């Protein structure tokens, strides 16, 4: 009896300087009007191996909202390098936009993320301590990865 649909995501300002805040142009649809109920979260799963090392970058409480179609941008600051581990800094990582409806997550939106040095000389011989300033976030828009799980509206 599924109430809300995400229709599209659009990755914005990509690629960019590692520090810029993420931007996603989310597009969703909903059949009945709505009570103060949705819940969008951007996660930085920047540690391929362990979930004790991922930050939620921002929380947004969508609702109340009329029936029909809604598009909106989701601004959110960039993952805090401090809580990001060394060897784990210059490669692919993961972004998530999730959305929740009354306690329930019902749609996970994955994005593999490639953090590289943009500069010509450094990418050859990456320094021991990661210099995020010099880094560069190529989000792989081309190939989003989407999980949509049944809940009970």
């Amino acid at each position: 009896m599924a109430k809300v649909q995400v229709n599209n995501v659009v990755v914005l300002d990509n690629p960019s300087p590692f520090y810029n805040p993420f931007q996603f142009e989310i597009t969703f649809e909903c059949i009945e009007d709505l009570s103060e109920d949705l819940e969008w979260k951007i996660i930085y799963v920047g540690s391929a191996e362990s979930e004790e090392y991922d930050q939620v970058l921002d929380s947004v409480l969508v609702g109340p909202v009329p029936a029909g179609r809604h598009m909106f941008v989701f601004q959110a600051d960039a993952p805090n390098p401090g809580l990001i581990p060394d060897a784990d800094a210059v490669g692919v990582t993961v972004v998530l936009i999730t959305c929740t409806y009354r306690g329930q997550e019902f749609i996970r939106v994955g994005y593999y993320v490639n953090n590289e040095y943009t500069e010509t000389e450094l990418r050859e011989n990456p320094p021991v301590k990661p210099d995020f300033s010099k880094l560069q976030r190529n989000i792989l828009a081309s190939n989003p990865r989407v999980t949509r799980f049944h809940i009970n509206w």
Binding site: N8, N114, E124, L140, S142, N143, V146, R148
Partner: protein, 264 residues
């Protein structure tokens, strides 16, 4: 002034020379697999050894898929092939880095190949002509130039048309591709035009109409997108109508040109 329509009045419909080239390319691939340290690229990249490679590479390419793409006969000319060779250099330059050893050694695996082409000029040129004959026909480039403007400048310029710029995403819209069986849309049109698919309005229009048709099929007649789609399609019709007299001449010439390279 005459009645001057959207539709055209022009209707052409009509040792295989590809196999001489198909061959030559394989004889060109032989040389690549026979060169200092070129094995890394010899096969589809190990998904298991190079663990995250297929996430940093949208369009992968390797001398094997290259063998099999020739035998599947994808490459209509020296050029189409060469480009996929560029793709190797490109692909590696991303994962391994530009100035890096590997990126610099695939460079030759292309440098010998385009220094191979300069010694085989006189019959390559000869060959690919008796393949897609409107090759260096001026009316075809003219025509396509128009079509591509009509898109970028007119179609693509329609208030809330962005959801027709790009393909519908299968992973986002599960059952779009269940209803729509012949997806079309603006980015794809341009590809064709660069690939030079359209030689009259019929072909082109057919692709174009789908934009409105598929949307009726999936979003419905009285839906929002249909109406934007209604729009796109019209800006297009209007402009064809405008250009009818002009296009009609090109279409015709495209035709003679073809019929001509045919019995001669």
């Amino acid at each position: 002034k005459k009645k001057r329509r959207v539709g055209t009045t022009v209707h052409c419909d009509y040792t295989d020379p590809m196999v001489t080239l198909s061959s030559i390319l394989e004889s060109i691939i032989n040389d690549m697999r026979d060169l200092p340290n070129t094995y890394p690229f010899h096969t589809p990249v190990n998904a298991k050894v190079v663990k995250d490679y297929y996430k940093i590479i949208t369009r992968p390419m390797d001398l094997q898929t290259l063998r099999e793409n020739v035998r599947k006969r994808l490459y209509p000319s020296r050029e189409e092939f060469r480009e996929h060779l560029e793709l190797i250099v490109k692909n590696s330059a991303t994962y391994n880095g530009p100035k890096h050893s590997l990126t610099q050694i695939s460079q030759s695996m292309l440098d010998l190949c385009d220094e191979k082409l300069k010694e085989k000029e006189d019959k390559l040129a000869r060959l690919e002509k008796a393949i897609n004959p409107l090759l260096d026909d001026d009316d075809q480039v003219a025509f396509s130039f128009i079509l591509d403007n009509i898109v970028t400048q007119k179609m693509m310029a329609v208030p809330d048309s962005w959801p027709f710029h790009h393909p519908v995403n299968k992973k986002f819209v599960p059952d779009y591709y269940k209803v729509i069986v012949n997806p079309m849309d603006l980015e794809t049109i341009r590809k064709n035009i660069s690939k030079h698919k359209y030689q009259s309005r019929e072909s082109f229009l057919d692709d174009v109409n789908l934009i409105l048709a598929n949307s009726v099929k999936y979003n419905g007649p009285e839906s929002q997108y249909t109406k934007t789609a209604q729009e796109i399609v019209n800006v297009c019709y209007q402009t064809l109508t405008e250009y009818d007299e002009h296009l009609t001449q090109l279409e015709k010439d495209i035709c003679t040109a073809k019929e001509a390279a045919l019995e001669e």
